[PDB]
Structure 1
Amino acid sequence: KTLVHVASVEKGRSYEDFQKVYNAIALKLREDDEYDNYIGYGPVLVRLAWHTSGTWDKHDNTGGSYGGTYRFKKEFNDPSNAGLQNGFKFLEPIHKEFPWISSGDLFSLGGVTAVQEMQGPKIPWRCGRVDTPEDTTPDNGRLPDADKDADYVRTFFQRLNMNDREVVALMGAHALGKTHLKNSGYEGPWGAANNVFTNEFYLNLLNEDWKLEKNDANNEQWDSKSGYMMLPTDYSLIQDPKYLSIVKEYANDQDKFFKDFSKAFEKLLENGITFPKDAPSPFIFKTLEEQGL
């Protein structure tokens, strides 16, 4: 048994309307550049898009991006989501200016906007997520643990209908931002260019000299002398021979990584949603830079 969630376009809206929302997000990203010691809000908005989508369960179609349920306190206060309140606060003035967009559409568009504005690939995006009631909020515990191994990771993502290539591609988002000890019990960035979307995550996995250390929360993480870290689950991508081949591919082919990430990220954001056959095609938003804005 699975619920059906049919996409329904916000009434009367079309590409131009959502490009305006895109633009407002992008301009605020530019404006509020001081966030997180000048990393900016790009990374936390990408994380917010993933965590609001990553509760999905293919078996019964519970969770997922459609209902926008992070706005309800059970999901907002998931310990897995610690730190994401910053993303939500960023989006509040956006939602205030454009109150017609659904919460799910906003959270997922925030992630697309962030990736593109950080020079990542275009991510086609579809509208029509519809807010669902508080009792549809999925319980805590559907997001993954970081202390585990490759078998955990593989098994975890089966629940989101992601294969090895999809998983390795999605994990490349760890180029962005950092772990924060008070949020997750891990500390440090994965790389140097952490508000520009690149394939740095894979290059660092393969080329840094990693040491297994304990951080100040008494948790193990892999650290390099350049001041970078990897979670146990990140490092698992080079411990497993199947993941390791894919890491090598993306480390050696920027374009391939961009294309595969774009597909997997859109899929993650669309899991659980039925698009009517007459739905609009996916939108590909222009960046501020492409618009001369």
Structure 2
Amino acid sequence: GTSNRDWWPNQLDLSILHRHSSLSDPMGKDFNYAQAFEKLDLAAVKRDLHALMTTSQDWWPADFGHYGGLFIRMAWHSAGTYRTADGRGGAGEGQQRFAPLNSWPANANLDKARRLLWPIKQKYGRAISWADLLILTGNVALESMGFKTFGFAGGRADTWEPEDVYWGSEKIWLELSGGPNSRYSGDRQLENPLAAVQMGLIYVNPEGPDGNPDPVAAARDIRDTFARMAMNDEETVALIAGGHTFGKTHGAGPASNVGAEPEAAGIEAQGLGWKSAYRTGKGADAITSGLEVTWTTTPTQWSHNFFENLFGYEWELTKSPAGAHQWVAKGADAVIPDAFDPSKKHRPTMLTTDLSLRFDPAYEKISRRFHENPEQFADAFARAWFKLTHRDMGPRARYLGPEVPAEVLLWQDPIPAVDHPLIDAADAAELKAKVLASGLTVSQLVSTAWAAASTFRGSDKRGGANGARIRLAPQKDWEANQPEQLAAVLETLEAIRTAFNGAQRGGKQVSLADLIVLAGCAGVEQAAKNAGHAVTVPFAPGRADASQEQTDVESMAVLEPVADGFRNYLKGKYRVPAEVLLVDKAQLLTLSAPEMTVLLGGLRVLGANVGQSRHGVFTAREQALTNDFFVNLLDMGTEWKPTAADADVFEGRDRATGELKWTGTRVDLVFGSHSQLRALAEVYGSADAQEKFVRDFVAVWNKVMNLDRFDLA
């Protein structure tokens, strides 16, 4: 069947905004996963998972009699798709169970691991999500094998369809770099927002870069990709050596024995894939990656034997039975147990990427410290495993259950507890009138609140106005935030706050985070009044102010908005057209196409553009909240043409006289071009729509102001 994507492969795709509707969700619209989870008997779940670890099923027999290694790799892969650049990927939505992740080559035979867990999922039903179960299972594995975890939080609600994520442009699984859709350019520079070296891998190629078995060069790829997953050198060494303390790889025969991935298999495979014609197809004959390595002498128990081996032997390049490059210990005795035959033993083996931990000079120092002090190793691995598996969960307010750790970690962008009474509606009214009396304009108040709140991204639930981090490094100096204007606004609001707080009793006070948002609300109310409309913008207090010491400046860098179509901003010239970047930002904000449209049209006429650009400001009453953007955009009396200076800027001229009326960007004009967006613009540009436009704008403004407010969930 030929589709619109086939005929117009470069048109903008809006379906990405319209996923996760109540149509596709089988749970009631009233279902609240947090409340279901809070009544789960988590201890009972963990006992069943503990019993599972050593209950081998004949359709996928457990190596060494223990599924622990399999499940730790399963949880690691669930979390390991995360990219700091956009927050997309991670374990938080249980997306391993859907396309394309369920069928990535690097996920081969994790379909078996998930199926092992069905009986437990079936038993507990809606009170534990797949997403939470995958993580919990990896924790129980580690515990059952003698490793003390740092903690676990529930609260990952299941999703019911695949996410639309850019995983790369290659058309061939595992394609080596330098092809027509190369994710690499220059000196091995990986394109943003990607965090893997090849399409269908998690981080790196276990044989080495593009299959070249050089541990030194492999270390560069490890460092790059792990950094793009928010992990530093210590964390990376802890994780890889920690994971590879357990279990084994599977490469018993040639890879050409392995059939179709789950999404391509026949109907009879019932959602499983990679069916293998090599010998029994499973167990001792398993083929997963094509590598055949077993790292330690006790693969089913926590130990420090990974480093004892890595440092205690010299390593020789060899090939598995499938032909993959891997390494074996020179001169060693057969000390590693076999997974099925207790009368066979093997020499120690390693992957190229394991040897990176010894042959890269910065890794080596950490690996040596962890070898000499395995208690330091254990603690670093526990902390890193917690971070790995929770990095996309969002604020601590979303963490559920009895195993949540009490230690607050810097990477959580923590927000202090509120320890005083909050402002009420009459105080809010009083503050809004003081803000308006100070002389701050609609444009300044709207712009500042939009800057503070619009750092939120629903992908990993980081960012938003809670914390008042806009006043801190590095937000206060971002070019999109207009640092000089911002500093002057913030100083006026801080003086209002100090005067309000100093006049109170009872210990009531207002945070600056709350006041920035409330001042934005006042701005919107005043804009509506300027157009002849009386509205109240809803406001919910309770935000708190974070300190600079509770804010990791480097980790905050990925939230910098380099493209923000809502403020008509583009920090430089990109390969991706600006309208595509708009839709991308809208998806991170959790906005539908109607919400995006109304929000943008309102922000234009309120003066939210960076630098006070007149691009898209299609009104003669700036700072009044009207539907003028839409009415003027859609006026066929105006003709539009790209400028000589810039193909990305357009002049709108009177068709009859040639007089210049307006200028706009691709982000402004896409609303009069794209057939679905123009149909939305028409609704808000109609003669009956001014009241609807105001009401819808206020509702979307309030939604953005509240995006991080999980303390009110």
* Residues 1:15 and 1:213: Cα distance change in structure 2 (over 3 Å): farther
* 1:228 alignment partner in structure 2: 348
* 1:178 alignment partner in structure 2: 248
Aligned CA RMSD, in angstroms, stands at 2.3
* Residues 1:204 and 1:107: Cα distance change in structure 2 (over 3 Å): same
* 1:66 alignment partner in structure 2: 92
Larger Rg computed on CA atoms: 2
How far residue 39 of structure 1 moved from its aligned partner, in angstroms, is 4.1
Q: Which amino acid aligns with 1:250?
A: F
Q: Which amino acid aligns with 2:250?
A: H
From 67, 77, 84, the counterpart of 2:110: 84
Q: Deviations over 1:49-89 (max 9, x none)?
A: 00011001111111111110111142111110112122112
* Residues 1:37 and 1:159: Cα distance change in structure 2 (over 3 Å): same
How far residue 12 of structure 1 moved from its aligned partner, in angstroms, is 4.3
* 1:162 alignment partner in structure 2: 231
Q: Distance in 2 between matches of 1:282 and 1:249?
A: 33
Q: Deviations over 1:225-257 (max 9, x none)?
A: 341211111111111111011111111222111
Q: Determine if contact 2:291/2:326 at 8 Å carries over to the other structure.
A: yes
* Residues 1:130 and 1:221: Cα distance change in structure 2 (over 3 Å): same
| 1:273 and 2:332 aligned | no
> Aligned ranges for residues 79-118 of structure 1 at < 5 Å?
79-100=105-126, 101-118=128-145
| 1:23 and 2:43 aligned | no
Q: Distance in 1 between matches of 2:402 and 2:307?
A: 29
> Aligned ranges for residues 1-293 of structure 1 at < 5 Å?
10-14=34-38, 17-32=41-56, 35-100=61-126, 101-136=128-163, 138=165, 139=167, 141-144=200-203, 145-148=205-208, 149-172=218-241, 173-181=243-251, 182-224=287-329, 225=332, 226=334, 227-277=347-397, 279-280=399-400, 283=403
Q: Determine if contact 1:58/1:272 at 8 Å carries over to the other structure.
A: no
Q: Which amino acid aligns with 2:46?
A: Y
Q: Determine if contact 1:75/1:137 at 8 Å carries over to the other structure.
A: no
Structure 1 segments of 4 or more deviating over 6 A? Answer: none
Where structure 1 has 5 or more consecutive residues not aligned to the other structure, the ranges are 286-293
TM-score, with structure 1 as normaliser: 0.88
SS of the aligned residue for 1:28 comes to helix
* 1:290 alignment partner in structure 2: none
How far residue 9 of structure 1 moved from its aligned partner, in angstroms, is 5.5
Q: Deviations over 1:165-188 (max 9, x none)?
A: 000000121011111012112102
Q: Which amino acid aligns with 1:158?
A: A
Q: Determine if contact 1:33/1:41 at 8 Å carries over to the other structure.
A: no
How far residue 280 of structure 1 moved from its aligned partner, in angstroms, is 4.2
Q: Distance in 1 between matches of 2:401 and 2:233?
A: 28
Query: Which has more helix, going by share of residues?
Result: 1
Q: Determine if contact 1:212/1:220 at 8 Å carries over to the other structure.
A: yes
SS of the aligned residue for 2:397 comes to coil
How far residue 13 of structure 1 moved from its aligned partner, in angstroms, is 3.5
How far residue 147 of structure 1 moved from its aligned partner, in angstroms, is 1.9
Q: Distance in 1 between matches of 2:399 and 2:72?
A: 25
Q: Distance in 2 between matches of 1:132 and 1:233?
A: 33
Relative contact order: is structure 1 or structure 2 higher (C-alpha 8 Å, sep ≥ 6)? Answer: 1
Q: Distance in 1 between matches of 2:162 and 2:135?
A: 21
Where structure 2 has 5 or more consecutive residues not aligned to the other structure, the ranges are 1-16, 18-31, 168-198, 209-217, 252-286, 335-346, 406-713
TM-score, with structure 2 as normaliser: 0.37
The number of aligned residues is 279
SS of the aligned residue for 1:203 comes to helix
Q: Determine if contact 2:34/2:400 at 8 Å carries over to the other structure.
A: no
